[PDB]
Amino acid sequence: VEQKKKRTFRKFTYRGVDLDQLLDMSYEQLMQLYSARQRRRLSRGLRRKQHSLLKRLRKAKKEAPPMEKPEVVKTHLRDMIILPEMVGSMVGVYNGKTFNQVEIKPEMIGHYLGEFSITYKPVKHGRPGIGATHSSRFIP
Amino acid sequence: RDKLNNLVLFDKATYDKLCKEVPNYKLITPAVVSERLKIRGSLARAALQELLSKGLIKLVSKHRAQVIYTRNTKG
Amino acid sequence: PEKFQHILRVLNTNIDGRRKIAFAITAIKGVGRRYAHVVLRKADIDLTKRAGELTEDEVERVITIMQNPRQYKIPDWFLNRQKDVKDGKYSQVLANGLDNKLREDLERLKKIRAHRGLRHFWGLRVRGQHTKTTGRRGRTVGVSK
RNA sequence: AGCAGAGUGGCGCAGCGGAAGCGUGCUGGGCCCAUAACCCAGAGGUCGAUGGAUCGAAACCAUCCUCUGCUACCA
RNA sequence: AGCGUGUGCCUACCCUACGCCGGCAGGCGCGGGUAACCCGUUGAACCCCAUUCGUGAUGGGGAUCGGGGAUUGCAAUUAUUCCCCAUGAACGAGGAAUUCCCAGUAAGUGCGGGUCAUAAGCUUGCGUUGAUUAAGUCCCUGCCCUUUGUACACACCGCCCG
RNA sequence: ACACCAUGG
Ligand SMILES: [Mg+2]
Ligand SMILES: [Mg+2]
Ligand SMILES: [Mg+2]
Ligand SMILES: [Mg+2]
Ligand SMILES: [Mg+2]
Ligand SMILES: [Mg+2]
Ligand SMILES: [Mg+2]
Ligand SMILES: [Mg+2]
Ligand SMILES: [Mg+2]
Ligand SMILES: [Mg+2]
Ligand SMILES: [Mg+2]
Ligand SMILES: [Mg+2]
Ligand SMILES: [Mg+2]
Ligand SMILES: [Mg+2]
Ligand SMILES: [Mg+2]
């Protein structure tokens, strides 16, 4: 991550707090910076076996040689919020057929992991076919 | 539509003409006073309430959607 | 009464002194009706005046209350940028900082290339509305070859 | 090269200074059980180019260019 | 106002009073109802009575979009629904065509049931305000009965000539 | 005292 004027140094940091404190802030203290949905999610707190994904997000950034990035923790879990711990690691987020990869940046904190691999192709249109207008009907 | 450039408040010419019309008009309503001069129509209400205070016009009816005055109950 | 100068040039926008204040200052962006009424009540000035009937010692107070609201006890649930995403401030962004904040928010979204930024890039609908039978900007397509 | 006519919507054209439409073609609607006919709306303009007069033009004047008919037919 | 619904067997959820807290959505605390018994005397909307606006795409209209706060749920991103500040598009009565309607009816207006952990621009019922126009005809679109004609019977969307 | 009204997987 080469972000250098808008997150840590200079202009801005996440709601006025810098990432280095977001790495020690307890979840109860952190959910007061988050928006309503992410706060409600952690207040219900039903992290289930959404835990264990944190155990392979972590423990994959320590098997990785320094000056490089963890490889891929590919998953179906589209509804994960992005805790500041997950900053830096690479993830493969399933879209229904494919694990499209994402390199987590400190700007995605508090979005959903599903909000970074789309489920369909952005359409370019063809040419209208036989039923496309009432001007079209007849064949022998 | 159109362009009706009315006056938001009086100037001296219109202000004297508003007092020189009192004996002339049998029916006085804000809309008629809006059409005679170039008045913003919400200033005509205040002008007529002021004229009424000075006994210069006589109130014949007041309602939410309509007000009517006449010249000094004469002629 | 008192045909005095009416056209106002408040910060980066033209107000017409021919209207009432509470509906004249809404010409500025970021200032609606519900905001302008409160900004005028806190400033203790009257509310039946045309916007031209304000001498230079009222307009200044009105704008300095309009720009620093939390100083004059305007609440937080009432401001148009709350918990500012990158600085934690509470503010009303008023006239030109509004377009800058909007473009900065769209560019932030497109940078990480989230989904909202991709719908903003392709000029499509960003909320969850159907686009099969609405929007309809282009031209008619001919079916006969 | 010369005379005469014309240059305007994809195409045929109207438009005697207060200034862009007609007929056809094109695309979509209507009518009908359905197709043609018929009805409606839409799209598409450097009024050939360049200067000038005029308060103002596509129109008038001058130069040039491009099509068509007819003679000239010309080392 | 009127028609209704209300604690569910598998199935786990119902309708709410009143006190407090919060701008708001909403939260906490204690009661009633298996119901002409409690919500409920169902303080509904349009309508009625007074303010401000003034013919200006305006204080008409509320699309599109930014930022924040709640609730349901195992989970809300491709925004479930709700609340708040802001942005403020088309639209100035609609071409050729074409639908429904005779009296407590058309139209305006709100309220219940259905689906419903969450939730109506739908539909199914209820009230409330309440007109103009007709008391006819067979012209148009069709229907019924009789007489008549037919080269049709897969029945005129038929058959059939060069 | 009669405008136009062609055709059918
Ligand atoms: Mg209505
Ligand atoms: Mg209903
Ligand atoms: Mg219910
Ligand atoms: Mg319902
Ligand atoms: Mg349905
Ligand atoms: Mg019919
Ligand atoms: Mg019969
Ligand atoms: Mg017979
Ligand atoms: Mg036979
Ligand atoms: Mg036939
Ligand atoms: Mg044959
Ligand atoms: Mg026929
Ligand atoms: Mg034939
Ligand atoms: Mg034949
Ligand atoms: Mg046949």
Side-chain angles (χ1 to χ4, degrees):
Chain A
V1 178
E2 180 51 6
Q3 199 74 335
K4 65 174 167 280
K5 307 188 181 177
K6 298 185 179 184
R7 280 298 279 90
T8 65
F9 313 129
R10 303 189 67 151
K11 195 178 182 183
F12 287 151
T13 80
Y14 187 64
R15 307 199 201 265
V17 181
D18 195 2
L19 183 144
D20 86 78
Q21 306 132 316
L22 305 183
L23 292 177
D24 65 75
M25 263 179 164
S26 87
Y27 292 131
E28 183 277 346
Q29 297 189 24
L30 177 59
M31 67 171 65
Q32 304 300 345
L33 305 188
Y34 278 162
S35 318
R37 186 61 85 179
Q38 334 306 336
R39 191 186 311 130
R40 179 170 173 102
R41 179 61 167 286
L42 299 188
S43 299
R44 289 176 69 82
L46 297 179
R47 283 181 283 188
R48 199 66 51 73
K49 306 300 178 187
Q50 189 148 112
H51 295 163
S52 88
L53 179 55
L54 294 171
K55 291 176 45 65
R56 301 219 298 129
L57 260 290
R58 181 166 24 80
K59 176 258 151 76
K61 52 217 322 182
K62 73 137 54 178
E63 316 297 82
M67 288 65 90
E68 209 130 14
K69 60 270 172 199
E71 307 271 18
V72 268
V73 194
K74 49 167 64 179
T75 56
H76 287 189
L77 284 181
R78 290 184 69 81
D79 80 358
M80 254 293 220
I81 70 176
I82 299 208
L83 298 172
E85 293 81 297
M86 300 155 58
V87 175
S89 159
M90 290 209 68
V91 187
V93 179
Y94 196 71
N95 81 340
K97 61 146 60 180
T98 294
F99 300 88
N100 310 107
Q101 77 178 344
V102 190
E103 153 65 32
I104 290 179
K105 297 307 197 319
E107 297 95 288
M108 320 171 172
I109 190 182
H111 290 263
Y112 279 117
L113 269 177
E115 220 174 340
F116 299 103
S117 70
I118 70 177
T119 61
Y120 67 93
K121 285 194 65 176
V123 317
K124 275 71 65 185
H125 281 290
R127 194 75 181 270
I130 307 304
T133 50
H134 288 212
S135 65
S136 177
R137 292 189 81 136
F138 185 94
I139 61 171
Chain B
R1 275 195 209 68
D2 189 90
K3 280 313 150 304
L4 266 190
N5 183 285
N6 301 269
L7 295 187
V8 316
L9 287 115
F10 294 115
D11 197 278
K12 189 48 197 319
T14 9
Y15 183 63
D16 57 66
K17 193 188 175 203
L18 179 126
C19 204
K20 290 273 95 205
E21 49 99 300
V22 174
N24 197 33
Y25 297 172
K26 293 172 67 174
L27 171 75
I28 294 150
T29 68
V32 170
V33 196
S34 323
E35 301 296 17
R36 292 304 172 285
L37 327 173
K38 307 309 177 295
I39 297 311
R40 198 84 133 182
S42 67
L43 161 76
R45 281 184 279 109
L48 294 182
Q49 289 163 2
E50 204 168 82
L51 296 183
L52 174 78
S53 80
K54 273 86 160 170
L56 301 171
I57 62 176
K58 300 289 188 276
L59 179 72
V60 319
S61 168
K62 189 187 171 189
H63 181 276
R64 163 172 56 92
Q66 187 68 63
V67 69
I68 311 174
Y69 314 86
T70 195
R71 74 211 215 293
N72 298 305
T73 58
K74 66 172 293 173
Chain C
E2 183 66 335
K3 207 61 51 218
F4 211 70
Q5 198 260 352
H6 287 316
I7 315 101
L8 285 329
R9 183 32 186 248
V10 70
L11 62 145
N12 284 327
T13 169
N14 273 37
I15 312 277
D16 51 331
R18 278 178 313 113
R19 224 196 307 209
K20 325 265 284 210
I21 353 94
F23 290 95
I25 50 190
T26 80
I28 325 173
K29 275 174 86 168
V31 179
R33 312 139 82 120
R34 188 94 157 78
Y35 195 68
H37 279 268
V38 183
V39 177
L40 284 196
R41 284 269 177 247
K42 293 284 184 178
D44 74 38
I45 88 165
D46 208 60
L47 207 30
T48 87
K49 314 223 194 77
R50 300 310 177 102
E53 307 170 2
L54 289 203
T55 38
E56 268 101 326
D57 266 29
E58 310 85 284
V59 43
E60 47 91 8
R61 173 158 32 107
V62 158
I63 55 175
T64 182
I65 302 189
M66 184 188 291
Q67 284 161 299
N68 322 65
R70 267 198 310 131
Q71 285 196 350
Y72 307 101
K73 297 281 297 177
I74 305 183
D76 301 347
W77 56 270
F78 202 74
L79 309 184
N80 79 351
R81 196 162 186 100
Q82 299 165 32
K83 291 188 179 179
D84 182 18
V85 179
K86 246 66 179 167
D87 205 21
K89 265 57 170 291
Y90 288 75
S91 190
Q92 198 84 357
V93 278
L94 241 15
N96 217 337
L98 193 43
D99 304 358
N100 320 334
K101 257 63 179 179
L102 167 61
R103 149 172 37 78
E104 187 159 39
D105 290 334
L106 299 181
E107 224 278 350
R108 180 187 73 249
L109 281 192
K110 191 201 161 179
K111 182 89 63 43
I112 65 184
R113 64 190 333 107
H115 189 42
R116 291 230 306 276
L118 294 181
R119 296 292 269 191
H120 272 297
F121 194 45
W122 305 328
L124 289 164
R125 283 289 163 79
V126 181
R127 276 94 195 253
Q129 317 112 340
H130 300 357
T131 0
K132 186 195 203 159
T133 37
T134 44
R136 229 78 160 184
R137 67 256 195 181
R139 36 82 205 176
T140 300
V141 201
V143 181
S144 303
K145 312 306 173 184

